[PDB]
Design a binder for this molecule. Structure first.
Ligand SMILES: COC(=O)N[C@H](C(=O)N[C@H](C(=O)N[C@@H](Cc1ccccc1)[C@H](O)C(=O)N1CSC(C)(C)[C@H]1C(=O)NCC(C)(C)C)C(C)(C)C)c1ccccc1
Lengths: 116, 116
């Protein structure tokens, strides 16, 4: 679908995410052309799973602690299309429960920006 | 234009930004549907403008040193339209001098996200 862009309303989508360490869960994610990679909340992962340290630069600053990197690919199913997005890896929010669909996922569902 | 999305290339455009505190200047800005508000570099402003402190939530978390708010509206001319976008205020990055076109500006140019 076409998602209008509105400062007062964050463009979001329901996405079924399977981290392959837990039953797949559907979450609300922000659609974010400004994110190099997708961010999944740590909650969707089972307690014990190996995750890699990683450094992330955001607007608030550079962090070595807040985010981890997955070890297994994450599969994402969008409401409209039946084929899953397969992300070889993406980020995990250990801290603030964030869910962000970045350009890695947007590329695979052939998302575009349109500026008339 | 239609702008494709690719994890390995930031979606950017050249814009002319007028802060009304000196002459209009060209910047290359990130098109960012995850940004509630536009971000322009402090480098645009002279060494003694007055800018209000502001708190912002980013990926590095809550920052309250990094961004200021303009005191005057900012006018933005995009290559493909004659009428400038006029933002009542936007964020000013004093740390990294980032340029990010957010949803406030995208709404004014009727920007949309399209997922097939
Ligand atoms: C109350 O006023 C606000 O705090 N607005 C915030 C905002 O828009 N922050 C933007 C922001 O950082 N948005 C980002 C998404 C985001 C929103 C809130 C917390 C964390 C992340 C942005 O689309 C992005 O990907 N950016 C901006 S900077 C960047 C490096 C180019 C890239 C990035 O962070 N990449 C890192 C990853 C891949 C982890 C997202 C600004 C500072 C650029 C205006 C906000 C507050 C709650 C939910 C959503 C947004």
């Amino acid at each position: 679908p076409v998602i209008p862009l509105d400062p007062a309303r964050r463009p979001v989508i329901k996405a079924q995410v399977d981290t392959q360490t837990s039953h797949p869960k559907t979450i609300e994610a922000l659609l974010d052309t400004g994110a190099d990679m997708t961010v999944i909340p740590i909650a969707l992962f089972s307690s014990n799973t190996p995750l890699k340290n990683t450094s992330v630069l955001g607007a608030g600053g550079q962090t070595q602690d807040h985010f981890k990197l997955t070890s297994l690919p994450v599969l994402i199913r969008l409401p409209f299309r039946t084929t899953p997005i397969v992300l070889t890896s993406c980020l995990v929010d250990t801290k603030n429960n964030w869910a962000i669909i970045g350009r890695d996922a947007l590329q695979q569902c052939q998302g575009v920006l349109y500026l008339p």
